[PDB]
Design a protein around this ligand. Structure first.
Ligand code: ACO
Length: 170
């Protein structure tokens, strides 16, 4: 497996693997923006929705892949607001259920941080389901927990839960 930054030209190659990754992550129970009704057509639509921003460079996308087999992915959304050029949001960090516990998440976040700095972003922030494995993961990676917002979103099963806000100053 190799860590790769996705570009407009390599997007098609990774499209299916990224869609499958969202699919498996959602059905594995994670709160990443979708409900249990998620099907592959919806996952492909989500993927296609990333293409314009990836080509523009406002959204950065990485995958850890073995050829076209996508094992994990992460995204960095660069704030485009005139007064927000110091910040970026980390989103959609996901590792296939069967590829977890092997350091892929850390590999991705290390790259995300390095590239955020190249883009002169001093603040990385994100939000994740409170109490989830992701919370232990970000804490382990030295992100600082700000607090929670109750009823922020629902797990795929429809149950509302709090989201925890984390940040790291680079
Ligand atoms: C801000 C947003 O981008 S929130 C979106 C969060 N993503 C998701 O919830 C999707 C579902 N969860 C996942 O895909 C994965 O479980 C991820 C990406 C959090 C973890 O990735 P993995 O690749 O398995 O973790 P990695 O193996 O890189 O772990 C880094 C470390 O995190 C911590 N960690 C990971 N999983 C756990 C866990 N189950 N319990 C406690 N600590 C854990 C550990 O300390 C570990 O470092 P140490 O390995 O030396 O033991």
């Amino acid at each position: 497996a190799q860590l790769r930054r996705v570009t407009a030209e390599s997007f098609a190659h990774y499209r299916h693997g990224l869609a499958q990754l969202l699919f498996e992550t959602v059905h594995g129970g994670a709160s990443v923006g979708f409900m249990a009704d998620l099907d592959m057509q919806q996952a492909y639509a989500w993927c296609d929705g990333l293409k314009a921003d990836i080509a523009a460079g406002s959204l950065l996308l990485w995958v850890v892949a073995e050829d076209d087999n996508v094992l994990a992915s992460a995204q960095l959304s660069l704030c485009q607001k005139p007064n927000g050029l110091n910040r970026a949001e980390v989103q959609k960090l996901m590792v296939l259920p069967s590829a977890r516990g092997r350091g892929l998440g850390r590999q991705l976040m290390d790259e995300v941080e390095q590239v955020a700095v190249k883009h002169k972003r001093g603040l990385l922030h994100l939000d994740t389901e409170a109490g989830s494995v992701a919370e232990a993961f970000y804490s382990a990676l030295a992100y600082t927990r700000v607090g929670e917002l109750p009823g922020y979103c629902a797990t795929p099963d429809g149950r509302l839960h709090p989201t925890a806000i984390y940040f790291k100053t680079l």
